[PDB]
Write a protein that binds this ligand. Structure first.
Ligand SMILES: OC[C@H]1O[C@@H](O[C@H]2[C@H](O)[C@@H](O)[C@H](O[C@H]3[C@H](O)[C@@H](O)[C@H](O[C@H]4[C@H](O)[C@@H](O)[C@H](O)O[C@@H]4CO)O[C@@H]3CO)O[C@@H]2CO)[C@H](O)[C@@H](O)[C@@H]1O
Ligand SMILES: *[C@@H]1O[C@H](CO)[C@@H](O)[C@H](O)[C@H]1NC(C)=O
Ligand SMILES: [Cl-]
Ligand SMILES: [Cu+2]
Length: 235
């Protein structure tokens, strides 16, 4: 169980964003139903009042918490990958609009899942804002926890892959638009019971074998990290 508190821009904390620039759900409960509209931006998907300003090139940092800011972040059992997508806010998540900007499953060297490292990075991970058409966007951060993913939720509703999904409202101001945004995949829709990465047994299968659900990272993506950029206790 985990939620997003706010975002940083170029290492500058933008302040508490809950129900403000984040479309926050009432709680940190997982989404599990792959066909639910809840797969779009979780269970309380609606325009919230503000939208964070950025430029192409900027480093946008998501910040997750479990119960309170800079706490244990998310329970260690919840091993899994992490993705970020983007879409035009016009679409409100609907249609085939979602383009992936980032992916991190398992790191062979360090021998840690993305989530493992997110605990260590005080709940912070980042992407570099791409050169798309200025305007309003949604950035969808997605944690998949696989602690019960040896079953499918459709066949057993008290197990299955767990999605922790958070949509941030981001306004891109300065960009030259050298890589305009493509069409994307829909959510719900893009993940099924048969998609790879959705059913997987982390107790028997070695993490090295894990393949994250498609789609692939779009070519116009600029990376890419899971690491603390800010100190929240300093404020
Ligand atoms: O460890 C491997 C084993 O895991 C089993 O699944 C466990 C998870 O390991 C465990 O982390 C998970 O814990 C949940 C708990 O079920 C929730 O009820 C609880 O919900 C809290 C929330 O954390 C709070 O922040 C919020 O304020 O309130 C709610 C209500 O109390 O959150 C924790 C995680 O933080 O429980 C799972 C099952 O109970 C697998 O099932 C097993 O197969 C694996 O071998
Ligand atoms: C999953 O969501 C779909 C779409 O809202 C709904 O028809 C279905 O009842 C849900 N299934 C599970 C068991 O709930
Ligand atoms: Cl859980
Ligand atoms: Cu949980």
């Amino acid at each position: 169980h985990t939620l997003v508190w706010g975002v940083w821009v170029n290492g500058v904390d933008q302040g508490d964003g809950r129900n403000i620039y984040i479309r926050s759900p009432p709680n940190n409960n997982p989404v599990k139903n792959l066909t639910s509209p809840d797969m779009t931006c979780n269970v309380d998907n609606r325009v919230v009042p503000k939208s964070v300003p950025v430029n192409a090139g900027d480093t946008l940092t998501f910040e997750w918490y479990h119960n309170t800011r800079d706490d244990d972040i998310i329970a260690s059992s919840h091993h899994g990958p992490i993705a970020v997508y983007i879409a035009p806010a016009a679409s409100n998540g609907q249609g085939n609009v979602w383009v992936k900007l980032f992916e991190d499953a398992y790191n062979v060297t360090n021998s840690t899942w993305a989530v493992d490292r997110l605990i260590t990075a005080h709940g912070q991970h980042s992407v570099v804002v791409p050169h798309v058409a200025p305007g309003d966007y949604l950035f969808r951060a997605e944690i998949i926890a696989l602690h019960e993913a040896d079953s499918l939720y459709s066949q057993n509703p008290i197990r299955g892959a767990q999605f922790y999904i958070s949509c941030a409202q981001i306004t891109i101001n300065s960009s030259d638009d050298s890589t305009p945004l493509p069409a994307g995949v829909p959510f719900p829709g893009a993940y099924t019971d048969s998609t790879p990465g959705i059913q997987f047994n982390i107790y028997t299968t070695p993490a090295t074998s894990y393949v994250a659900p498609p789609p692939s990272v779009w070519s116009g993506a600029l990376g890419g990290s899971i690491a603390q950029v800010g100190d929240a206790s300093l404020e």
